[PDB]
Amino acid sequence: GDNNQGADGVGNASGDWHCDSTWMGDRVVTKSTRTWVLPSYNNHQYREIKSGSVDGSNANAYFGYSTPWGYFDFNRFHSHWSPRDWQRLINNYWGFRPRSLRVKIFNIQVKEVTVQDSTTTIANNLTSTVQVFTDDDYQLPYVVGNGTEGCLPAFPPQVFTLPQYGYATLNRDNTENPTERSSFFCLEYFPSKMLRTGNNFEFTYNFEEVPFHSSFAPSQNLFKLANPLVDQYLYRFVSTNNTGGVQFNKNLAGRYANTYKNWFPGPMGRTQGWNLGSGVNRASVSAFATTNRMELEGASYQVPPQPNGMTNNLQGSNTYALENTMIFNSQPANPGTTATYLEGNMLITSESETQPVNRVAYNVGGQMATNNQSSTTAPATGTYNLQEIVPGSVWMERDVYLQGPIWAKIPETGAHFHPSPAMGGFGLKHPPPMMLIKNTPVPGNITSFSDVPVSSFITQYSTGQVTVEMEWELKKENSKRWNPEIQYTNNYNDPQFVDFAPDSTGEYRTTRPIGTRYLTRPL
Amino acid sequence: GDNNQGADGVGNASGDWHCDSTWMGDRVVTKSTRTWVLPSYNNHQYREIKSGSVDGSNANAYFGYSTPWGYFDFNRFHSHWSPRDWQRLINNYWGFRPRSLRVKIFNIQVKEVTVQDSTTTIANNLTSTVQVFTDDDYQLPYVVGNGTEGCLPAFPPQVFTLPQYGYATLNRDNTENPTERSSFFCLEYFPSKMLRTGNNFEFTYNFEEVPFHSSFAPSQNLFKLANPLVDQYLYRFVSTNNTGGVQFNKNLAGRYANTYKNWFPGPMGRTQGWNLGSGVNRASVSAFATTNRMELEGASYQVPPQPNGMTNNLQGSNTYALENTMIFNSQPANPGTTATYLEGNMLITSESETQPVNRVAYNVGGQMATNNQSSTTAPATGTYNLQEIVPGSVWMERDVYLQGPIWAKIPETGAHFHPSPAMGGFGLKHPPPMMLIKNTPVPGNITSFSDVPVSSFITQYSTGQVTVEMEWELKKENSKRWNPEIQYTNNYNDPQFVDFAPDSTGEYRTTRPIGTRYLTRPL
Amino acid sequence: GDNNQGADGVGNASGDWHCDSTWMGDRVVTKSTRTWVLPSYNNHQYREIKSGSVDGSNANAYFGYSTPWGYFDFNRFHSHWSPRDWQRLINNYWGFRPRSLRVKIFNIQVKEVTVQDSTTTIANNLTSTVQVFTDDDYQLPYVVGNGTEGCLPAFPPQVFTLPQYGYATLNRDNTENPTERSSFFCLEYFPSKMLRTGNNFEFTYNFEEVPFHSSFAPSQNLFKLANPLVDQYLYRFVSTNNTGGVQFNKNLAGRYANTYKNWFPGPMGRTQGWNLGSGVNRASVSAFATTNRMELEGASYQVPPQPNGMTNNLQGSNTYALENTMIFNSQPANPGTTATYLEGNMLITSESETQPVNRVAYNVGGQMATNNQSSTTAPATGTYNLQEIVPGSVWMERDVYLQGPIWAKIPETGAHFHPSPAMGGFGLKHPPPMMLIKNTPVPGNITSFSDVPVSSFITQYSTGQVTVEMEWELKKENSKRWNPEIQYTNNYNDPQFVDFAPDSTGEYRTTRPIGTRYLTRPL
Question: Which pairing describes strands B159-161 and B130-135: parallel, antiparallel, or unpaired?
Fold first, then answer.
C-alpha cells in the first residue's frame, strides 16, 4: 500500500516517518527512519587508490578504486533496535532470525553551494537529480558486511553522512602494482533509478532460511552430562602391576574426570591472555610481534576475531584473551585517529557464558601421547596449543551484541565449511542487496567545445530520509526451570547520568555492551 | 468533508480560516484558528537539563530532558470562546461539558535564515518538511494540563510561538542526579506524519463522558435547608441540673444554630487570610516560611491552589486567602521575570459565591470535645484547623474562568478519590492527545565522511495556521425564580477604554476575570 | 471434560497430577497440585474456646468455637506461581487480575491408627468416608483471607496438614463471656458431599470484575508533572511591603516548590521510623507502648499494616517504618513460637518504588496555618501528623508479593470506602467459596444402649491430592521508554547455594521477597 499522493512534485512529502517497533505473537517488525547527507565524492570521478607497505607490514599493501558512489549500510543491530526492544528480545526469547526487509528513500533535497569571496552560500536547486540502484545480482564487490563504519546511527535524531564505496582488488607480489586479474567495476554500467526532488525509491527483499540464533547459555557442563548418582558400566585402564600387565577399575559415581564422553568441545587456537582490571601484565610489550597471524599469499595477516569455538574470558576472572575478543568504543571517534585508548574507554566483550561448551582461548587444549612405551621407556605426553574440527564436536557460536553486525556474505568460491561469521551474526549466501546512491554531475559554465571531458562541475550535495523495516522471527522460551533466571537489568550504583540516553551536551551515551545470552537452557 | 482541492502543492491554500462560533439548540460548536511560529529548538538536539536546590528549597531540584519538539497547547477557556460567547454561556445556562474535538494544521511555510556579515536575510525553501504527530496512547509525559504558558492567544490576530517540550523525571535524593528508574523518552521513536509546504494534517477526538460543570450558585445555606415555620420533632440536650442529670429541649421554629442536619460541608485545610484593598496586613512578611506545604519524597512542596471544598473570599469582604486562590496577570509578561507585582496589576479570583456550601478557608473548621467529663472535670473543647472527607459531605467544585485551564489528566496510578482538578476544569482519564511538531534538520555543507554525527545545520523555522474546533454540550436553565437574577454585565464607571479589546498601541486589554457562577439555584 | 474412568472404586486413580502453567496470549492459566493430610480434630467434637486478656491487653480477649472441620486455604501468591513464572509476570506486564478458578479433590485415602501396648500400627480402611462442602452463599464466618497459615506449600513435593476451622464471635465487655448476639454456626447443617476412597470432588468459580493490579512504578514525581522549560501564567503571593500590602511574583521555569498543583498525595498516618542495617536506633525500647493503635469497642488494637497511601522505606535509605511494613520469615516456623528473631532472618518489605505518588510514613504530612494575622500578630503554622482522603487524591496501592495473600473479603456492612485490602491483593465482595472437609466419625465398640451420645471413636486420618487451577488476565506493556528498564534478576554475589531451591537437607530456601513493581510508567 503506502499510497496517499495528491500530486508528485515539490510541495508534497514523499513519505511519512515511521520509527516504531511492533511485537506481534512471536515475530516482531522493527521500523527505523534516519536522515542522511551525501557529499560529492572525488568531484564526480573514479580514481585508483593504492598503498605500499605501511608500518613495516607488507600485508597492508592493496590496489583498488574509490568511486563517487555512497552506499547505505544499515548493518548493525542497534540501527533497528532500541535498548528497551533489545532488552525484551534477549530476556524472554531463546532465538531470533530475520525474515523480510523493505527499504525506502524519500524526501530527496539537492543543495547547491557557491563560494564568491568566501561567502559560501547554500541554495537548493529543484531540477537536479540523484541516482539510486540496489545491486541484487551480487556482481559487485560486497563491502557491507565486514564491520566498517557508516551504519545508521544508534539514536534516531542523529544525522549521518554516507560512506564512500571503494574496493581492494588483486595486487602483484605484495606491492601496490596491479595484475592481469585485477578487475575494474564501473558502477554506472548498471541500470539505476534517477530521482528528482519529488520522487521516492523503495525496495523489498526476503531472506533465505537460516538457523535461529541462540540466545541461551547452557545450564550444564559438556563433560558433566552424566548423572552423579549411578556409576557407569564401563571400565577404565588405571595402572599396571609389577609384571607387565594391565589393571582396570570401574567408572564410579559422580567422578567426571574419568568417564566415557560422547561429545567433545569445539576447535581452538591458543591466544594470549591479558589481565584487565587489577592488572599485573608484563610491561612495555608491543603486541604486533606475538599476535596470532594466518599467512595468506605470502604475507602475515592478523585475524583479531578468532574462529568460533572458544571463550576469551573465564567466568568473572579478570584475564581476557584480547586477540579473541570484540572491542568497541563507548562513543564514535574521528576518522583516522591514532590516539591510544586505555581500557576504561572501551566496551570489551566477554564470552564467559559459553564456557561450559567452549574451551578457553588462553589455556592449552589438552595433551596426547608422544611415545610408544616398552619395558625400557616410560609413557610420555605433551600439550597441544591448537586443535580443529573433530567428529562429534559441539561448540557455541559467537554472540551478537547491540553494537555488532547483523550478517555477512559467504565468499563465492568452490567450498566452505560451516558458514558462520567469526565476528558474529548470520552468514548469508545472498545478503540484502547493496544500495548505492550518487549525485549526478551538473557541469559549470563551459563556453567552447573540447573533446577532453568536462572537469568543471557545480559543487552540490543532497539529503533526505531513509527507512528500513525488517521482520524478525522469534522462538519462545519453553523452559521449566524452577528458580529465577538472570535478566538484563538497568542497575547502576550511584548514577551521574542515565545510560543509553543523551548527555547535557546532546551526546548519546553507551556505557556497556549488551549480549543475547541470559536465558539458561539444560544443554 | 472539507474537500476543495484543485491540486496539492505550492499555489494551493491548504485550508480556509474558520474562527466563528455556532449556537444550535443546547449544544455549541466553537471553531478557532490561529497563526503559529516554531523556532528551531536546541539546534535539533535532545539535551538533559537538571537543577539543584535554588532559593534554598530542595524541592526545586529536578532531572529531565529538553527536546526539540514544540507542542500545541490549546488548553485554556479563552482560546475557544470570545468574551461575548462566554457571556451568553454563563448567563442563561446551568452547565456545560465538551463532547468532540477536531484539529487541523495547514498552510505550512518553512523559512530559511542566513547571516553573511550580519545581513540575516530570510528566504523560504519549498522542499523542506515538518513532522507532526499526536500522541493518542498516552505513553509520553503529559505536560499539557498543568496550567503553563504557550496556549492559543486570547485575541485571534495575535501570532504565538510554540512552547518547547520537556519533562522532569525522577531524581536521586532531592539532588540533580538521576536514578535507575529515571526514564528517557525519545519522541522520534513514534510514527509521525511529515508535511511539506503543500500538505496539511488533521485529527479527531471524542471525549469521555464527564459530569456537567456547575454554572449555578446555590440559593440557600446548607445548614438552613429546613423551613423556618414549623419546628422539628427532635429534641436536643440543653443543660444539666443540680444533681447530675440531663435536661432536654425542643428544636423550635427557625432557630438554625441547633437543629438536626442531614448533610455536611466539604473538606478544609486552613489557609492564611490576607487583607486586600483597604489593607492593614502585617508589615514585612516573607510568606514562603508560613505557607501550607505538603511534604512528599522528603521535600516540602507548596500547593498554592488548595484542594476543593473551600472558599477564599467571604461575600464582598476584603480579606482573601491568597494560598487558596487563582491569580492571573492582566497582560502576558516576559518569560523568566522576577519583577514584584502589586495587587493592582493582578486578576484575583473570588470563590465567594460558593460560600453557602463551602467552609471559609481562613476560619477554623469547627470544634470537638477534648475530654470526658465527670463530677470532678468540666467539659472542654478545642478547634480543629483541618478536616477531610466525611460520609454525607457536599461541596462546590472550583469554578472555571475565561482565563483558566479546561481539563487535566488523572495521573495513572493504582487509585484516586474523586478526580477533579484543584485548579479547575474537567478531570479526564484520556485527555485530548498531545500534538507535537518539529522542523526536520537540513544539514549544511559537509565535504567529508565522519562517523561522528553531523553538527552543522541550516538554521530554519516554520509557520502556518492551526484550527481547533470543539463541540460543547449544555444544560438549559429550568429555574422558576420570580425576581431577576444576576447577569454578567459590561458596566464600567467612566471608561477610558473598552475592556476586552485593543488599546491604542494594539495591545489586547483584560481588566477583570469572568467566572461561570451567576445563575442561582435552590441548592 | 476430564473423563477417563474404567470403573469407579479402589484400583482406579481418581485424577491425574497437573502442576504446569500455560502462557497463552495475554492470559495465563496456572495449575497446581498438592498432597494434604487431615488430622482428626477435637476427637470429632465442637468446642467453645475463649480467652481473657493475655499480655496485659484486653483486646486479646475473644469468645469462639473450634470445629472439627479443616479447610483448604490456597490463598497466597506462591501457591499458584513458580519463581520463574512470577519473574516473567512482573518483568514484562503492567497488570494482572484473576478470572476463573476450578478446584478438584481426588485420591482420598482414609487410614486407621491403632495402639495396642504402644505399637501404633497404621492400616487403612476402604469403607470409611470424608465430607467435603464448599460454602458459596458466604453464610459462615470467612477466615480465609486474613493472612494466616495453612496455605498450599511453596514447593510442590511438600505435604501440608490442613488448618482447623474456628471463629471468634462477639464477647461481652472485653472479657471471655458471650453476649446475646454471639452466634453459633454448626457446619454440619449444610449439605455436604460424602466421598469414599474411590470418589472425587470438583468445583468451579468465576471471579467478579475487579481492577487490574498495577505492576508499574511511576516515572515522575507527582508534584513535578509540569515541564521545566516554560513558566506558568499563574502568580503567587510572595511577601508584603512596609505598609500592609501584598506583593506577587510569577511562577517561573522549573521551580517546583512553588507552582500550582492539580493533584495531591494520598492519606497518611504517621508511623515510627526504625533504622535497619547500619543501625543507631534507641536502646531497650518496648514497642507495644508507642505503636499506632486504633481503638474499637473500648479496647486498643494495633493495626500493623497501615492503610494504603504511604511508603515505609525511602529510596534505598536504611530507615524503615516497621509499623507500616509487611514482614515475612525466610522459612516456616513452629506453631506457637515465642522466639525472638533478629533482622537477618526476616524478609522485610520495602515500598520505596511508590515514593513519587506516596507520602513517607515516618515524616510529617505537611503544615497549615494556625492563626489569623493582623498588624499585631505574625503568621504562624504547625505540622500535622495525620491527614485523610481529599478531593483530588492519588495514591499507590500496596504491592503484592510472591509470599503475600491474593485476595480478601469485604466485610458485609452498610457501607465501605474504596475496598482494597491493607495487606494487599484484590478486595472482593464474593471471594472464592470456602472449602471445608472433615473425617466422618466411625464409632468404636459399644455393647449397650445409652442416650448420652457416643464418646468412643476409632482414631483415623485421611490424605490425598488437591488441584487448584486459576485463570489470570494480563495487561501488556505498551511503554515507549528508550533506555533499559529494571528487571528482576537472579544476581547473588558468591553464592553458597541457589536461592528458591532445596538445601542439602531437603529444605526449600527463600532468601528475599519478590514484588511486582519493576516496569516504569510516566505517571
Answer: unpaired
Of A483, A489, A500, nearest to C483 by CB-CB distance is: A500
Instruction: HSE, CB side, 13 Å, CA atoms: give it for residue A210.
Output: 29
Residue B126 gets the label, from left (phi > 0), alpha (psi -120 to 50) or beta, of alpha
- Chain B: give the shortest CA distance to residue A286, in Å: 28
CATH number 2.170.30.10 is the correct assignment for the domain at B8-523: yes
B287: closest CA among C381, C317, C1, C157?
A: C381
Cell output for B312:
477564599
Residue in C19, C490, C516 to test binding to A, most A beta-carbons within 10 Å: C490
- The closest alpha carbon to A464, from A106, A196, A151, belongs to A106
> Are the beta carbons of B188 and A13 separated by less than 8 Å?
no
Q: Decide: B407 and B431 in contact? Cβ < 8 Å.
A: yes
Domain ranges of chain A: 8-523
Residue B495 in grid coordinates: 471608561
A512 inside 8 A of chain C by CB: no
- Cβ–Cβ below 8 Å for C92 and A92: yes
Measured between CB atoms, does B180 come within 8 Å of chain A? yes
Please give the interface size between A and B, counted as residue pairs whose CB atoms are below 8 Å apart.
179
Distance from CA of C401 to the nearest CA of B (A): 16
C476 touches chain B (CB under 8 A): no
CA-to-CA separations, C376 to B275, B280, C244, in angstroms, rounded:
14, 10, 12
The cell numbers describing B141, all together, are 509525559
Task: Answer whether B268's CB lies under 8 Å from B384's CB.
Answer: no
Residue ranges of E strands in B364-409:
367-369, 381-383, 386-387, 407-409
Nearest to A10 among B10, B44, B172 (CB): B10
Show the CA angle centred on residue C177, arms to residues C176 and C181, nearest 5°: 120
CA distance A115 to A459: 10
Q: How many angstroms separate the first and last alpha carbons of chain C? A: 45
DSSP, collapsed to helix, strand or coil, labels residue A451 as coil
The cell for A152 is 545508521
Minimum distance, in Å, between the CA of residue C169 and any CA atom of chain A: 43
- C386 and chain B in contact, CB less than 8 A: no
* Dist CA C458 CA C440 (whole Å): 10
Instruction: Give burial (CB, 10 Å; 0-12/13-18/19+) of B78.
Output: buried
The answer to whether the CB of B431 falls within 8 A of the CB of B449 is no
| Alpha-carbon gap, residue B89 to B29, rounded angstroms | 12
* Integer CA distances (angstroms), C335 to C61, C163, C442, C511, in order: 20, 11, 29, 21
Burial letters for C172-211: b for 16+ Cβ neighbours within 10 Å, e otherwise?
eebeeebeeebeeeebeeeebbebbbbbbbebeeebeebe
* Nearest CA among C295, C294, C324, C296 for reference residue C308: C324
Q: Where are the beta strands (DSSP E) in B73-137?
A: 93-105, 109-114, 121-124, 130-135
Number of residues in chain B: 523
- Report the residue of C19, C23, C31, C489 to disrupt the A interface, i.e. the one with the largest count of A CBs within 10 Å: C489
**B328 in C contact zone (CB under 8 Å):** yes
Chain C residues with CB under 8 Å of B422 CB are: 260-264, 392
Is A83 in a helix, a strand, or coil? helix
Experimental method, per PDB record? cryo-EM
Resolution in A: 3.3
